[PDB]
Design a protein around this ligand. Sequence first.
Ligand SMILES: Cc1nnc2n1-c1ccccc1N(c1ccc(Cl)cc1)C[C@H]2C
Length: 126
Amino acid sequence: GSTNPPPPETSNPNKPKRQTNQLQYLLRVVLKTLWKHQFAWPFQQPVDAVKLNLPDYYKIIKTPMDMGTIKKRLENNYYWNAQECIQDFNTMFTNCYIYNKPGDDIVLMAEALEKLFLQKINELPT
Ligand SMILES: Cc1nnc2n1-c1ccccc1N(c1ccc(Cl)cc1)C[C@H]2C
């Protein structure tokens, strides 16, 4: 597998976008808390399948997502509402569970980050 795909889009002037209190919270509180977790690092940028020697990763994962992309989307006011952003977090975790297996180290890492994520979004601003 010789190259990585282009990363997901992080800017789109034409997409409907808003700054909501929930989207501000998702950047300021949720993403920033997660970012500092000991297990965050594999999720801080797109999977580099070339470096990691995973030539099947982008054969299996067709909607890549990561917290670096999310952070850029948030910073670029990409999203209309918090649900759109939440869906990108869910895609990121789901991708990890698809490519890997229960018990794998990376899965344990995603499970811990997901638990945190869910705790933080349990209550959102109005
Ligand atoms: C995310 C994610 N989803 N799948 C993986 N990634 C990774 C991304 C970046 C670096 C390493 C990753 N993995 C990984 C990270 C930490 C440990 Cl202890 C073991 C494996 C494996 C890779 C198959």
